[PDB]
Design a protein around this motif. Structure first.
Motif, PDB file in Angstrom:
ATOM      1  N   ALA A  32      39.727  27.167  30.016  1.00  0.00           N
ATOM      2  CA  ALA A  32      41.039  27.788  30.163  1.00  0.00           C
ATOM      3  C   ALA A  32      41.159  28.995  29.241  1.00  0.00           C
ATOM      4  O   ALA A  32      42.099  29.136  28.475  1.00  0.00           O
ATOM      5  CB  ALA A  32      42.201  26.808  29.947  1.00  0.00           C
ATOM      6  N   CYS A  33      40.152  29.874  29.329  1.00  0.00           N
ATOM      7  CA  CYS A  33      39.998  30.984  28.400  1.00  0.00           C
ATOM      8  C   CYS A  33      41.050  32.067  28.565  1.00  0.00           C
ATOM      9  O   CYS A  33      41.116  32.977  27.729  1.00  0.00           O
ATOM     10  CB  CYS A  33      38.606  31.599  28.518  1.00  0.00           C
ATOM     11  SG  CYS A  33      38.309  32.399  30.139  1.00  0.00           S
ATOM     12  N   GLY A  34      41.873  31.995  29.619  1.00  0.00           N
ATOM     13  CA  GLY A  34      42.929  32.979  29.818  1.00  0.00           C
ATOM     14  C   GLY A  34      42.334  34.372  29.876  1.00  0.00           C
ATOM     15  O   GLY A  34      41.332  34.613  30.545  1.00  0.00           O
ATOM     16  N   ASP A  54      38.542  30.210  33.539  1.00  0.00           N
ATOM     17  CA  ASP A  54      39.980  30.098  33.679  1.00  0.00           C
ATOM     18  C   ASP A  54      40.303  29.980  35.162  1.00  0.00           C
ATOM     19  O   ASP A  54      39.621  30.556  36.011  1.00  0.00           O
ATOM     20  CB  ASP A  54      40.734  31.312  33.135  1.00  0.00           C
ATOM     21  CG  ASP A  54      42.191  30.998  32.860  1.00  0.00           C
ATOM     22  OD1 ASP A  54      42.494  30.392  31.823  1.00  0.00           O
ATOM     23  OD2 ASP A  54      43.072  31.325  33.704  1.00  0.00           O
ATOM     24  N   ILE A  55      41.381  29.252  35.471  1.00  0.00           N
ATOM     25  CA  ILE A  55      41.761  29.021  36.849  1.00  0.00           C
ATOM     26  C   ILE A  55      42.319  30.275  37.495  1.00  0.00           C
ATOM     27  O   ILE A  55      42.286  30.367  38.728  1.00  0.00           O
ATOM     28  CB  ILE A  55      42.735  27.826  36.920  1.00  0.00           C
ATOM     29  CG1 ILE A  55      42.787  27.298  38.357  1.00  0.00           C
ATOM     30  CG2 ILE A  55      44.124  28.232  36.445  1.00  0.00           C
ATOM     31  CD1 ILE A  55      43.307  25.894  38.443  1.00  0.00           C
ATOM     32  N   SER A  56      42.773  31.267  36.719  1.00  0.00           N
ATOM     33  CA  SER A  56      43.468  32.438  37.264  1.00  0.00           C
ATOM     34  C   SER A  56      42.515  33.610  37.416  1.00  0.00           C
ATOM     35  O   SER A  56      41.927  34.078  36.426  1.00  0.00           O
ATOM     36  CB  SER A  56      44.611  32.862  36.334  1.00  0.00           C
ATOM     37  OG  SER A  56      45.109  34.170  36.656  1.00  0.00           O
ATOM     38  N   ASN A  57      42.361  34.094  38.658  1.00  0.00           N
ATOM     39  CA  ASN A  57      41.557  35.297  38.839  1.00  0.00           C
ATOM     40  C   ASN A  57      42.197  36.504  38.166  1.00  0.00           C
ATOM     41  O   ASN A  57      41.482  37.377  37.673  1.00  0.00           O
ATOM     42  CB  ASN A  57      41.255  35.586  40.307  1.00  0.00           C
ATOM     43  CG  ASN A  57      39.880  36.147  40.475  1.00  0.00           C
ATOM     44  OD1 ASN A  57      38.911  35.408  40.542  1.00  0.00           O
ATOM     45  ND2 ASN A  57      39.773  37.469  40.482  1.00  0.00           N
ATOM     46  N   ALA A  58      43.536  36.596  38.154  1.00  0.00           N
ATOM     47  CA  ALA A  58      44.159  37.701  37.433  1.00  0.00           C
ATOM     48  C   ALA A  58      43.789  37.668  35.957  1.00  0.00           C
ATOM     49  O   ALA A  58      43.587  38.715  35.333  1.00  0.00           O
ATOM     50  CB  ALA A  58      45.678  37.641  37.588  1.00  0.00           C
ATOM     51  N   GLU A  62      41.304  40.323  34.131  1.00  0.00           N
ATOM     52  CA  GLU A  62      41.724  40.981  32.900  1.00  0.00           C
ATOM     53  C   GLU A  62      40.712  40.731  31.782  1.00  0.00           C
ATOM     54  O   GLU A  62      40.385  41.645  31.019  1.00  0.00           O
ATOM     55  CB  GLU A  62      43.132  40.520  32.509  1.00  0.00           C
ATOM     56  CG  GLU A  62      43.698  41.229  31.291  1.00  0.00           C
ATOM     57  CD  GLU A  62      43.913  42.713  31.531  1.00  0.00           C
ATOM     58  OE1 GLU A  62      44.097  43.113  32.702  1.00  0.00           O
ATOM     59  OE2 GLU A  62      43.895  43.476  30.545  1.00  0.00           O
ATOM     60  N   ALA A  63      40.217  39.497  31.654  1.00  0.00           N
ATOM     61  CA  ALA A  63      39.235  39.225  30.609  1.00  0.00           C
ATOM     62  C   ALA A  63      37.974  40.054  30.804  1.00  0.00           C
ATOM     63  O   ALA A  63      37.363  40.487  29.824  1.00  0.00           O
ATOM     64  CB  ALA A  63      38.879  37.741  30.574  1.00  0.00           C
ATOM     65  N   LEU A  64      37.544  40.237  32.059  1.00  0.00           N
ATOM     66  CA  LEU A  64      36.382  41.075  32.337  1.00  0.00           C
ATOM     67  C   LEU A  64      36.672  42.532  32.008  1.00  0.00           C
ATOM     68  O   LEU A  64      35.832  43.221  31.421  1.00  0.00           O
ATOM     69  CB  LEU A  64      35.965  40.946  33.800  1.00  0.00           C
ATOM     70  CG  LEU A  64      35.234  39.675  34.215  1.00  0.00           C
ATOM     71  CD1 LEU A  64      35.271  39.481  35.732  1.00  0.00           C
ATOM     72  CD2 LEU A  64      33.784  39.746  33.724  1.00  0.00           C
TER      73      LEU A  64
END
Ligand SMILES: C[n+]1cn([C@@H]2O[C@H](COP(=O)(O)OP(=O)(O)OP(=O)(O)O)[C@@H](O)[C@H]2O)c2nc(N)[nH]c(=O)c21
Ligand SMILES: Nc1ncnc2[nH]cnc12
Length: 288
Positions: A32-34, A54-58, A62-64
């Motif tokens: 769940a790295c957000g 993380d479950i969220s592609n958004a 953003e992390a990428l």
């Protein structure tokens, strides 16, 4: 401001916690790295590979974005969209063969309580953790402290339909008062929902209690024994003598109180220093 002081304090807690359990060369899996805001903390410990899910592609997108904008880091960074809690981790990582499992540490910051939505999810999360980790490795992170929650709940009369407390920067509102109706005990360790507001951080989002005793007993079932359970206040008080001079100039100054000592004071003290606890466990045996 109070919220800026809270963010700096919690960032310091994460620095100390990551450093405590990470060693040079380690591979870290962050559940769940957000948006992936702790990469520099792992880099300071000298990891070889970071795997964030993380479950969220958004969030991962953003992390990428944020990762690709850094520099020539000495470590590999893998960022994956997947559900770390509700599905086998093998689902999420099948298409990322560059991951180096089993890993040395599993981290999860301000998120593991979401795995306590149901017992099925809590167990799937723990099975994911232990299957990912080497024997002797550590699982650590930061969660709302069920013991502080219970203290606040024990001060709320049964007449209150939606038990609630807070201050100018945070609020907790329980979906129901079954705790109070059941003799100040949750009817189940799982699915005990409350909405959480934190100024400019969390917009009244539902989350679930993580009763520490149940987390610990389930972790033992899966082969992990307790290493750490200190609330943020105690953890910081114990670690600050060795950390004052290790912090960056900006983080040290941010932690400086009006009395020249370090920590939080003023209205952020309750949400920053009491509402959350550290946790860590060590995998001591294989799970069948
Ligand atoms: C994800 N999350 C974050 N917090 C709190 O919010 C603070 C900031 O949370 P954060 O460091 O995860 O994200 P931030 O918005 O600061 O950074 P960005 O994503 O890079 O923009 C933490 O220090 C906690 O106090 C959380 N608090 C609770 N109760 N529940 C959560 O799910 C939760
Ligand atoms: N199940 C989950 N997996 C990963 N990140 C999450 N954030 C919230 N729930 C999550």
């Amino acid at each position: 401001s109070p919220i800026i002081k809270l963010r700096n304090f919690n960032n310091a807690i994460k620095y100390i916690l990551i450093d405590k359990f990470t060693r040079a060369g380690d591979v870290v899996l962050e559940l769940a790295c957000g948006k992936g805001g702790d990469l520099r903390k792992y880099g300071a410990a000298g990891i070889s590979q970071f795997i964030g899910i993380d479950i969220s592609n958004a969030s991962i997108t953003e992390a990428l974005k944020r990762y690709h904008s850094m520099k020539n880091l000495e470590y590999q960074v893998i960022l994956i969209t997947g559900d770390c809690f509700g599905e086998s981790l093998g689902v999420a990582v099948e298409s990322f063969p560059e991951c180096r499992f089993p890993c040395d540490i599993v981290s999860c910051q301000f998120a593991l309580h979401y795995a306590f939505e149901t017992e099925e999810k809590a167990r799937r999360m723990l099975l994911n953790v232990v299957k990912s980790l080497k024997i002797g490795g550590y699982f650590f992170g930061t969660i709302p402290d069920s013991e502080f929650i219970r203290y606040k709940m024990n001060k709320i009369p049964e007449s209150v339909e939606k038990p609630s407390w807070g201050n100018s920067i945070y609020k907790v509102t329980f979906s129901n008062n079954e705790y109070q109706k059941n003799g100040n005990e949750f009817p189940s360790p799982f699915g005990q929902m409350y909405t959480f507001w934190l100024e400019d951080a969390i917009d009244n989002v539902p989350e679930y209690v993580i009763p520490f005793e149940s987390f610990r007993s389930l972790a033992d079932e899966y082969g992990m024994e307790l290493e750490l359970q200190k609330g943020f206040n105690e953890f910081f008080v114990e670690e600050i003598p060795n950390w004052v001079n290790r912090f960056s100039p900006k983080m040290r100054e941010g932690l400086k109180r009006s009395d020249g000592r370090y920590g939080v004071e003023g209205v952020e003290k309750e949400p920053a220093a009491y509402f959350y606890t550290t946790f860590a466990f060590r995998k001591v045996r294989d799970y069948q």
